[PDB]
PDB file of C-alpha atoms in Angstrom:
ATOM      1  CA  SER A   1       0.000   0.000   0.000  1.00 11.57           C
ATOM      2  CA  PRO A   2       1.490   3.357  -1.234  1.00 10.62           C
ATOM      3  CA  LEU A   3       0.759   5.184   2.046  1.00 11.05           C
ATOM      4  CA  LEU A   4       2.880   2.893   4.315  1.00 11.04           C
ATOM      5  CA  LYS A   5       5.748   2.780   1.825  1.00 11.19           C
ATOM      6  CA  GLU A   6       6.434   6.518   2.385  1.00 11.26           C
ATOM      7  CA  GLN A   7       7.298   6.435   6.080  1.00 10.01           C
ATOM      8  CA  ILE A   8       9.683   3.568   5.419  1.00  9.10           C
ATOM      9  CA  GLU A   9      11.836   5.654   3.111  1.00 10.99           C
ATOM     10  CA  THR A  10      12.011   8.442   5.685  1.00 14.67           C
ATOM     11  CA  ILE A  11      13.340   5.856   8.143  1.00 10.91           C
ATOM     12  CA  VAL A  12      15.917   4.585   5.646  1.00 10.75           C
ATOM     13  CA  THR A  13      16.864   7.581   3.456  1.00  7.56           C
ATOM     14  CA  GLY A  14      20.243   8.928   4.440  1.00  6.48           C
ATOM     15  CA  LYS A  15      21.031   5.828   6.521  1.00  7.32           C
ATOM     16  CA  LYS A  16      24.421   4.359   5.538  1.00  6.67           C
ATOM     17  CA  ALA A  17      23.260   0.782   4.891  1.00  6.65           C
ATOM     18  CA  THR A  18      21.212  -1.392   2.566  1.00  9.72           C
ATOM     19  CA  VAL A  19      17.944  -2.048   4.373  1.00  9.53           C
ATOM     20  CA  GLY A  20      15.704  -4.799   3.085  1.00  4.42           C
ATOM     21  CA  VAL A  21      12.179  -4.852   4.500  1.00  3.85           C
ATOM     22  CA  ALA A  22       9.401  -7.399   4.374  1.00  3.56           C
ATOM     23  CA  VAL A  23       5.863  -6.854   5.682  1.00  5.71           C
ATOM     24  CA  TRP A  24       2.937  -9.215   5.002  1.00  3.56           C
ATOM     25  CA  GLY A  25      -0.294  -7.990   6.586  1.00  4.91           C
ATOM     26  CA  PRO A  26      -3.232 -10.276   7.453  1.00  4.61           C
ATOM     27  CA  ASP A  27      -5.429  -9.002   4.587  1.00  2.41           C
ATOM     28  CA  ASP A  28      -2.690  -8.338   2.009  1.00  2.52           C
ATOM     29  CA  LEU A  29      -2.298 -10.707  -0.918  1.00  2.00           C
ATOM     30  CA  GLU A  30       1.458 -10.030  -1.309  1.00  2.00           C
ATOM     31  CA  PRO A  31       4.195  -8.765   1.031  1.00  2.00           C
ATOM     32  CA  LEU A  32       5.362  -5.188   0.701  1.00  2.00           C
ATOM     33  CA  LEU A  33       9.117  -5.383   0.047  1.00  2.00           C
ATOM     34  CA  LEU A  34      11.960  -2.811  -0.069  1.00  2.00           C
ATOM     35  CA  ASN A  35      15.124  -3.710  -2.028  1.00  2.00           C
ATOM     36  CA  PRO A  36      13.993  -7.234  -3.011  1.00  2.00           C
ATOM     37  CA  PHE A  37      16.711  -7.511  -5.693  1.00  2.00           C
ATOM     38  CA  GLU A  38      19.645  -7.819  -3.273  1.00  2.00           C
ATOM     39  CA  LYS A  39      21.021 -10.816  -1.322  1.00  2.00           C
ATOM     40  CA  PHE A  40      20.906 -10.214   2.439  1.00  2.00           C
ATOM     41  CA  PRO A  41      23.234 -12.058   4.830  1.00  2.00           C
ATOM     42  CA  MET A  42      21.132 -13.958   7.342  1.00  2.00           C
ATOM     43  CA  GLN A  43      23.473 -14.565  10.283  1.00  2.00           C
ATOM     44  CA  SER A  44      21.486 -16.430  12.964  1.00  2.00           C
ATOM     45  CA  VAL A  45      18.106 -15.794  11.313  1.00  2.00           C
ATOM     46  CA  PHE A  46      18.265 -19.079   9.393  1.00  2.00           C
ATOM     47  CA  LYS A  47      18.376 -20.840  12.732  1.00  2.00           C
ATOM     48  CA  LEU A  48      14.603 -20.388  12.293  1.00  2.00           C
ATOM     49  CA  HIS A  49      14.788 -22.255   8.967  1.00  2.00           C
ATOM     50  CA  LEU A  50      16.935 -25.024  10.409  1.00  2.00           C
ATOM     51  CA  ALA A  51      14.496 -25.461  13.290  1.00  2.00           C
ATOM     52  CA  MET A  52      11.821 -26.088  10.702  1.00  2.00           C
ATOM     53  CA  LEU A  53      13.847 -28.817   8.954  1.00  2.00           C
ATOM     54  CA  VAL A  54      15.016 -30.454  12.180  1.00  2.00           C
ATOM     55  CA  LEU A  55      11.433 -30.521  13.504  1.00  2.00           C
ATOM     56  CA  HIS A  56      10.139 -31.659  10.115  1.00  2.00           C
ATOM     57  CA  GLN A  57      12.511 -34.599  10.296  1.00  2.00           C
ATOM     58  CA  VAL A  58      11.050 -35.119  13.797  1.00  2.00           C
ATOM     59  CA  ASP A  59       7.522 -35.067  12.364  1.00  2.00           C
ATOM     60  CA  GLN A  60       8.421 -37.801   9.851  1.00  2.00           C
ATOM     61  CA  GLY A  61      10.178 -40.025  12.379  1.00  2.00           C
ATOM     62  CA  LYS A  62      13.633 -39.317  10.916  1.00  2.00           C
ATOM     63  CA  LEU A  63      14.596 -37.911  14.335  1.00  2.00           C
ATOM     64  CA  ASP A  64      13.236 -37.972  17.868  1.00  2.00           C
ATOM     65  CA  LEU A  65      12.807 -34.880  20.029  1.00  2.00           C
ATOM     66  CA  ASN A  66      14.568 -36.414  23.055  1.00  2.00           C
ATOM     67  CA  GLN A  67      16.879 -38.607  21.014  1.00  2.00           C
ATOM     68  CA  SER A  68      20.162 -37.873  22.816  1.00  2.00           C
ATOM     69  CA  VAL A  69      23.208 -36.320  21.119  1.00  2.00           C
ATOM     70  CA  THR A  70      26.677 -36.805  22.567  1.00  2.00           C
ATOM     71  CA  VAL A  71      28.853 -33.704  23.055  1.00  2.00           C
ATOM     72  CA  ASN A  72      32.648 -33.537  23.282  1.00  2.00           C
ATOM     73  CA  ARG A  73      33.729 -30.044  24.375  1.00  2.00           C
ATOM     74  CA  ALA A  74      37.039 -30.480  22.501  1.00  2.00           C
ATOM     75  CA  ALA A  75      35.549 -31.207  19.079  1.00  2.00           C
ATOM     76  CA  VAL A  76      32.989 -28.339  19.002  1.00  2.00           C
ATOM     77  CA  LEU A  77      33.787 -24.838  17.751  1.00  2.00           C
ATOM     78  CA  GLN A  78      34.505 -22.141  20.367  1.00  2.00           C
ATOM     79  CA  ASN A  79      34.650 -18.487  19.523  1.00  2.00           C
ATOM     80  CA  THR A  80      30.967 -17.632  19.939  1.00  2.00           C
ATOM     81  CA  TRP A  81      29.058 -17.533  23.145  1.00  2.00           C
ATOM     82  CA  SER A  82      27.157 -20.727  23.479  1.00  2.00           C
ATOM     83  CA  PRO A  83      24.810 -20.830  26.450  1.00  2.00           C
ATOM     84  CA  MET A  84      25.130 -24.600  26.153  1.00  2.00           C
ATOM     85  CA  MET A  85      28.899 -24.615  26.820  1.00  2.00           C
ATOM     86  CA  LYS A  86      28.127 -22.685  30.001  1.00  2.00           C
ATOM     87  CA  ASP A  87      25.276 -24.810  31.359  1.00  2.00           C
ATOM     88  CA  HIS A  88      27.058 -28.187  31.272  1.00  2.00           C
ATOM     89  CA  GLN A  89      30.277 -29.190  33.016  1.00  2.00           C
ATOM     90  CA  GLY A  90      32.712 -31.942  32.338  1.00  2.00           C
ATOM     91  CA  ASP A  91      34.492 -32.983  29.173  1.00  2.00           C
ATOM     92  CA  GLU A  92      31.451 -34.733  27.744  1.00  2.00           C
ATOM     93  CA  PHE A  93      27.687 -34.526  28.223  1.00  2.00           C
ATOM     94  CA  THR A  94      24.592 -35.665  26.366  1.00  2.00           C
ATOM     95  CA  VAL A  95      21.828 -33.325  25.257  1.00  2.00           C
ATOM     96  CA  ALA A  96      18.560 -34.293  23.657  1.00  2.00           C
ATOM     97  CA  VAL A  97      17.634 -33.109  20.180  1.00  2.00           C
ATOM     98  CA  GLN A  98      14.804 -31.078  21.697  1.00  2.00           C
ATOM     99  CA  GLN A  99      17.288 -29.284  23.928  1.00  2.00           C
ATOM    100  CA  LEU A 100      19.613 -28.504  21.064  1.00  2.00           C
ATOM    101  CA  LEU A 101      16.594 -27.089  19.252  1.00  2.00           C
ATOM    102  CA  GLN A 102      15.584 -24.574  21.955  1.00  2.00           C
ATOM    103  CA  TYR A 103      19.214 -23.550  22.577  1.00  2.00           C
ATOM    104  CA  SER A 104      19.620 -22.854  18.880  1.00  2.00           C
ATOM    105  CA  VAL A 105      16.397 -20.873  18.418  1.00  2.00           C
ATOM    106  CA  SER A 106      16.085 -18.702  21.544  1.00  2.00           C
ATOM    107  CA  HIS A 107      19.719 -18.308  22.551  1.00  2.00           C
ATOM    108  CA  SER A 108      21.104 -18.322  19.002  1.00  2.00           C
ATOM    109  CA  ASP A 109      23.624 -21.037  20.018  1.00  2.00           C
ATOM    110  CA  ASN A 110      26.171 -21.802  17.277  1.00  2.00           C
ATOM    111  CA  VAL A 111      27.369 -25.124  18.659  1.00  2.00           C
ATOM    112  CA  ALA A 112      23.884 -26.442  19.249  1.00  2.00           C
ATOM    113  CA  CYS A 113      23.274 -25.094  15.753  1.00  2.00           C
ATOM    114  CA  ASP A 114      26.016 -27.068  13.995  1.00  2.00           C
ATOM    115  CA  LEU A 115      25.083 -30.317  15.750  1.00  2.00           C
ATOM    116  CA  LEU A 116      21.626 -29.777  14.343  1.00  2.00           C
ATOM    117  CA  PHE A 117      23.437 -29.537  10.979  1.00  2.00           C
ATOM    118  CA  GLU A 118      25.289 -32.793  11.524  1.00  2.00           C
ATOM    119  CA  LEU A 119      22.038 -34.499  12.480  1.00  2.00           C
ATOM    120  CA  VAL A 120      20.184 -33.386   9.346  1.00  2.00           C
ATOM    121  CA  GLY A 121      22.833 -33.841   6.675  1.00  2.00           C
ATOM    122  CA  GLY A 122      24.671 -30.524   6.456  1.00  2.00           C
ATOM    123  CA  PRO A 123      24.255 -27.119   4.802  1.00  2.00           C
ATOM    124  CA  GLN A 124      22.881 -28.218   1.443  1.00  2.00           C
ATOM    125  CA  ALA A 125      20.249 -30.339   3.200  1.00  2.00           C
ATOM    126  CA  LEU A 126      18.813 -27.120   4.623  1.00  2.00           C
ATOM    127  CA  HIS A 127      19.185 -25.466   1.221  1.00  2.00           C
ATOM    128  CA  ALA A 128      17.084 -28.262  -0.317  1.00  2.00           C
ATOM    129  CA  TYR A 129      14.509 -27.936   2.440  1.00  2.00           C
ATOM    130  CA  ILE A 130      14.139 -24.238   1.567  1.00  2.00           C
ATOM    131  CA  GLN A 131      13.484 -25.059  -2.087  1.00  2.00           C
ATOM    132  CA  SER A 132      10.870 -27.424  -0.625  1.00  2.00           C
ATOM    133  CA  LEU A 133       8.809 -24.683   1.018  1.00  2.00           C
ATOM    134  CA  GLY A 134       8.507 -22.983  -2.354  1.00  2.00           C
ATOM    135  CA  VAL A 135      11.233 -20.467  -1.518  1.00  2.00           C
ATOM    136  CA  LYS A 136      13.448 -19.988  -4.523  1.00  2.00           C
ATOM    137  CA  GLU A 137      15.305 -16.811  -3.572  1.00  2.00           C
ATOM    138  CA  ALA A 138      17.509 -18.195  -0.829  1.00  2.00           C
ATOM    139  CA  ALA A 139      20.867 -19.950  -0.597  1.00  2.00           C
ATOM    140  CA  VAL A 140      22.310 -21.743   2.442  1.00  2.00           C
ATOM    141  CA  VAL A 141      25.782 -23.174   1.839  1.00  2.00           C
ATOM    142  CA  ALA A 142      27.695 -23.037   5.117  1.00  2.00           C
ATOM    143  CA  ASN A 143      27.515 -23.700   8.853  1.00  2.00           C
ATOM    144  CA  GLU A 144      28.621 -21.760  11.889  1.00  2.00           C
ATOM    145  CA  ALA A 145      32.170 -23.072  11.968  1.00  2.00           C
ATOM    146  CA  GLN A 146      32.701 -22.169   8.321  1.00  2.00           C
ATOM    147  CA  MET A 147      31.166 -18.804   9.098  1.00  2.00           C
ATOM    148  CA  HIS A 148      33.554 -18.376  12.028  1.00  2.00           C
ATOM    149  CA  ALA A 149      36.524 -19.421   9.872  1.00  2.00           C
ATOM    150  CA  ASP A 150      35.720 -16.942   7.047  1.00  2.00           C
ATOM    151  CA  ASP A 151      33.615 -13.818   7.705  1.00  2.00           C
ATOM    152  CA  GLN A 152      32.461 -13.470   4.062  1.00  2.00           C
ATOM    153  CA  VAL A 153      30.750 -16.859   3.801  1.00  2.00           C
ATOM    154  CA  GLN A 154      27.851 -15.213   5.688  1.00  2.00           C
ATOM    155  CA  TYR A 155      26.993 -13.466   2.409  1.00  2.00           C
ATOM    156  CA  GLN A 156      26.483 -16.940   0.966  1.00  2.00           C
ATOM    157  CA  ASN A 157      23.971 -17.907   3.638  1.00  2.00           C
ATOM    158  CA  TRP A 158      21.637 -15.377   2.047  1.00  2.00           C
ATOM    159  CA  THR A 159      17.910 -14.778   1.576  1.00  2.00           C
ATOM    160  CA  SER A 160      15.751 -12.213  -0.215  1.00  2.00           C
ATOM    161  CA  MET A 161      12.953 -10.231   1.386  1.00  2.00           C
ATOM    162  CA  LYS A 162      10.420 -12.185  -0.611  1.00  2.00           C
ATOM    163  CA  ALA A 163      12.067 -15.371   0.668  1.00  2.00           C
ATOM    164  CA  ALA A 164      11.946 -14.128   4.247  1.00  2.00           C
ATOM    165  CA  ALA A 165       8.266 -13.549   3.700  1.00  2.00           C
ATOM    166  CA  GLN A 166       7.664 -17.119   2.462  1.00  2.00           C
ATOM    167  CA  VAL A 167       9.376 -18.882   5.369  1.00  2.00           C
ATOM    168  CA  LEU A 168       7.541 -16.664   7.888  1.00  2.00           C
ATOM    169  CA  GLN A 169       4.420 -17.459   5.875  1.00  2.00           C
ATOM    170  CA  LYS A 170       4.857 -21.232   6.293  1.00  2.00           C
ATOM    171  CA  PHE A 171       5.652 -20.899  10.012  1.00  2.00           C
ATOM    172  CA  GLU A 172       2.686 -18.671  10.993  1.00  2.00           C
ATOM    173  CA  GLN A 173      -0.002 -20.909   9.496  1.00  2.00           C
ATOM    174  CA  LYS A 174       1.041 -24.223  11.138  1.00  2.00           C
ATOM    175  CA  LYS A 175       0.744 -26.031   7.735  1.00  2.00           C
ATOM    176  CA  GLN A 176       4.287 -27.444   7.740  1.00  2.00           C
ATOM    177  CA  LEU A 177       4.702 -29.022  11.170  1.00  2.00           C
ATOM    178  CA  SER A 178       2.701 -31.072  13.608  1.00  2.00           C
ATOM    179  CA  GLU A 179       0.637 -29.213  16.189  1.00  2.00           C
ATOM    180  CA  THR A 180       3.356 -30.102  18.714  1.00  2.00           C
ATOM    181  CA  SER A 181       6.340 -29.110  16.553  1.00  2.00           C
ATOM    182  CA  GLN A 182       4.572 -25.850  15.691  1.00  2.00           C
ATOM    183  CA  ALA A 183       3.657 -25.123  19.289  1.00  2.00           C
ATOM    184  CA  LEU A 184       7.246 -25.779  20.337  1.00  2.00           C
ATOM    185  CA  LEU A 185       8.874 -23.636  17.615  1.00  2.00           C
ATOM    186  CA  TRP A 186       6.627 -20.664  18.423  1.00  2.00           C
ATOM    187  CA  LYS A 187       7.403 -21.229  22.090  1.00  2.00           C
ATOM    188  CA  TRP A 188      11.144 -21.114  21.588  1.00  2.00           C
ATOM    189  CA  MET A 189      10.713 -18.289  19.152  1.00  2.00           C
ATOM    190  CA  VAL A 190       8.358 -16.217  21.324  1.00  2.00           C
ATOM    191  CA  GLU A 191      10.118 -16.638  24.688  1.00  2.00           C
ATOM    192  CA  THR A 192      13.460 -15.583  23.224  1.00  2.00           C
ATOM    193  CA  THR A 193      15.221 -12.841  25.103  1.00  2.00           C
ATOM    194  CA  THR A 194      17.347 -11.794  22.111  1.00  2.00           C
ATOM    195  CA  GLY A 195      17.059  -8.442  20.357  1.00  2.00           C
ATOM    196  CA  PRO A 196      14.476  -6.747  22.567  1.00  2.00           C
ATOM    197  CA  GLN A 197      15.039  -3.329  20.956  1.00  2.00           C
ATOM    198  CA  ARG A 198      14.628  -4.490  17.349  1.00  2.00           C
ATOM    199  CA  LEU A 199      11.149  -5.584  16.263  1.00  2.00           C
ATOM    200  CA  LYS A 200       9.873  -4.928  19.781  1.00  2.00           C
ATOM    201  CA  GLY A 201      11.667  -1.577  20.254  1.00  2.00           C
ATOM    202  CA  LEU A 202       8.648   0.674  19.738  1.00  2.00           C
ATOM    203  CA  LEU A 203       5.660  -1.694  20.274  1.00  2.00           C
ATOM    204  CA  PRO A 204       3.151  -1.681  23.143  1.00  2.00           C
ATOM    205  CA  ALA A 205       4.260  -3.581  26.197  1.00  2.00           C
ATOM    206  CA  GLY A 206       3.315  -7.279  26.232  1.00  2.00           C
ATOM    207  CA  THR A 207       2.947  -7.743  22.457  1.00  2.00           C
ATOM    208  CA  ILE A 208       3.669 -11.330  21.672  1.00  2.00           C
ATOM    209  CA  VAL A 209       6.450 -11.333  19.080  1.00  2.00           C
ATOM    210  CA  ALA A 210       7.726 -14.620  17.682  1.00  2.00           C
ATOM    211  CA  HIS A 211      11.067 -13.728  16.108  1.00  2.00           C
ATOM    212  CA  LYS A 212      14.664 -14.767  15.506  1.00  2.00           C
ATOM    213  CA  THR A 213      17.484 -12.249  15.579  1.00  2.00           C
ATOM    214  CA  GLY A 214      20.643 -12.340  13.520  1.00  2.00           C
ATOM    215  CA  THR A 215      23.783 -10.250  14.050  1.00  2.00           C
ATOM    216  CA  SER A 216      27.301 -10.182  12.580  1.00  2.00           C
ATOM    217  CA  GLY A 217      30.638  -8.777  13.789  1.00  2.00           C
ATOM    218  CA  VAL A 218      31.854  -5.210  13.182  1.00  2.00           C
ATOM    219  CA  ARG A 219      34.918  -4.642  11.006  1.00  2.00           C
ATOM    220  CA  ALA A 220      36.402  -1.214  10.255  1.00  2.00           C
ATOM    221  CA  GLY A 221      33.146   0.491  11.229  1.00  2.00           C
ATOM    222  CA  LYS A 222      30.837  -1.688   9.154  1.00  2.00           C
ATOM    223  CA  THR A 223      28.302  -4.281  10.305  1.00  2.00           C
ATOM    224  CA  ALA A 224      27.519  -6.816   7.600  1.00  2.00           C
ATOM    225  CA  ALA A 225      24.203  -7.889   9.119  1.00  2.00           C
ATOM    226  CA  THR A 226      21.798  -6.684  11.841  1.00  2.00           C
ATOM    227  CA  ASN A 227      18.541  -8.594  11.319  1.00  2.00           C
ATOM    228  CA  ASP A 228      15.366  -9.446  13.173  1.00  2.00           C
ATOM    229  CA  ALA A 229      12.619 -11.491  11.491  1.00  2.00           C
ATOM    230  CA  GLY A 230       9.411 -12.734  13.094  1.00  2.00           C
ATOM    231  CA  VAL A 231       5.623 -12.721  13.427  1.00  2.00           C
ATOM    232  CA  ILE A 232       3.790 -10.050  15.459  1.00  2.00           C
ATOM    233  CA  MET A 233       0.369 -10.670  16.985  1.00  2.00           C
ATOM    234  CA  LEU A 234      -2.027  -7.813  16.317  1.00  2.00           C
ATOM    235  CA  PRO A 235      -4.663  -6.909  18.959  1.00  2.00           C
ATOM    236  CA  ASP A 236      -7.137  -9.288  17.268  1.00  2.00           C
ATOM    237  CA  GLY A 237      -4.803 -12.331  17.294  1.00  2.00           C
ATOM    238  CA  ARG A 238      -4.171 -12.094  13.547  1.00  2.00           C
ATOM    239  CA  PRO A 239      -0.649 -12.350  12.118  1.00  2.00           C
ATOM    240  CA  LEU A 240       1.690  -9.653  10.855  1.00  2.00           C
ATOM    241  CA  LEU A 241       4.961 -10.901   9.292  1.00  2.00           C
ATOM    242  CA  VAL A 242       7.766  -8.317   9.567  1.00  2.00           C
ATOM    243  CA  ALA A 243      11.420  -8.771   8.698  1.00  2.00           C
ATOM    244  CA  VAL A 244      14.133  -6.112   8.515  1.00  2.00           C
ATOM    245  CA  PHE A 245      17.648  -6.895   7.303  1.00  2.00           C
ATOM    246  CA  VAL A 246      20.190  -4.096   7.537  1.00  2.00           C
ATOM    247  CA  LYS A 247      23.088  -4.942   5.246  1.00  2.00           C
ATOM    248  CA  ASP A 248      26.652  -3.588   5.367  1.00  2.00           C
ATOM    249  CA  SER A 249      26.048  -0.628   7.685  1.00  2.00           C
ATOM    250  CA  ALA A 250      28.340   2.272   8.518  1.00  2.00           C
ATOM    251  CA  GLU A 251      25.911   3.221  11.330  1.00  2.00           C
ATOM    252  CA  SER A 252      25.813   2.522  15.076  1.00  2.00           C
ATOM    253  CA  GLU A 253      24.060  -0.381  16.782  1.00  2.00           C
ATOM    254  CA  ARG A 254      21.412   2.079  18.031  1.00  2.00           C
ATOM    255  CA  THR A 255      20.840   3.341  14.508  1.00  2.00           C
ATOM    256  CA  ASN A 256      20.787  -0.224  13.113  1.00  2.00           C
ATOM    257  CA  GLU A 257      18.321  -1.587  15.660  1.00  2.00           C
ATOM    258  CA  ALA A 258      16.199   1.562  15.584  1.00  2.00           C
ATOM    259  CA  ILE A 259      15.570   1.189  11.867  1.00  2.00           C
ATOM    260  CA  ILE A 260      14.251  -2.287  12.608  1.00  2.00           C
ATOM    261  CA  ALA A 261      12.040  -0.988  15.396  1.00  2.00           C
ATOM    262  CA  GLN A 262      10.718   2.006  13.486  1.00  2.00           C
ATOM    263  CA  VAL A 263       9.887  -0.191  10.493  1.00  2.00           C
ATOM    264  CA  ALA A 264       8.039  -2.656  12.728  1.00  2.00           C
ATOM    265  CA  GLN A 265       6.292   0.201  14.545  1.00  2.00           C
ATOM    266  CA  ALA A 266       5.141   1.741  11.286  1.00  2.00           C
ATOM    267  CA  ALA A 267       3.829  -1.654  10.107  1.00  2.00           C
ATOM    268  CA  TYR A 268       2.311  -2.447  13.502  1.00  2.00           C
ATOM    269  CA  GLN A 269       0.499   0.914  13.605  1.00  2.00           C
ATOM    270  CA  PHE A 270      -0.653   0.901   9.968  1.00  2.00           C
ATOM    271  CA  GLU A 271      -2.369  -2.469  10.476  1.00  2.00           C
ATOM    272  CA  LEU A 272      -4.164  -0.807  13.457  1.00  2.00           C
ATOM    273  CA  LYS A 273      -5.744   1.884  11.180  1.00  2.00           C
ATOM    274  CA  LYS A 274      -6.302  -0.494   8.203  1.00  2.00           C
ATOM    275  CA  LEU A 275      -9.753  -1.791   9.063  1.00  2.00           C
ATOM    276  CA  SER A 276     -10.869   1.540   7.600  1.00  2.00           C
ATOM    277  CA  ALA A 277      -9.645   0.763   4.051  1.00  2.00           C
TER     278      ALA A 277
END
């Protein structure tokens, strides 16, 4: 709608970054997209995608939620924080597949993440699963260790704003997972504590927001990726899919996360005055 599109460009004009935006209202037939012709590094956003595959392999009996996974502290990556590698002690411990799922979705855990990649058959297995949802504009080629070894592979774990809209589309509607896998994914993706001043930064207190953040490192004053994608519950319990991906930014963290919040707040508000038209 060409009334909402205006306030977005006042939020993004003059801002030293490439900002891709996706909004899909509850009565819109298509998402409104800004810069849909660029490839946006995902960072930990695709941990949402992986959770869909891993739980879809759970739905089809390929895996089991509390199937245990063995964990050697030596053989895992360690640069990132990993709330897992803080909770457990000793040189070796076992963690169920369910537990690696919640760690990887809410706490954006990169070790729990890669084990989920071993269990499912590696990066291209996710890639194929993304073709499987109907999403053509996305590529997933590498895992968190390969991301930590080379900081430009992140650009190859990319997605478009139309693609962000399709994954969020298939997660909102509960048509791709069992009622229990869906209810669990939402749960891990609503009770997250990550990125409170992104999509939630300017929304009323207590708004349920199911979302997954993604953030990159800062090199020479540029941040490759500062992303938050999720689903926002309107006052009437209807869905609003908002994703904001700020690419290659010469701005601050406040500026980067504020753009996300302002975009979400404009979309949140607009939907609130859209039962008029």
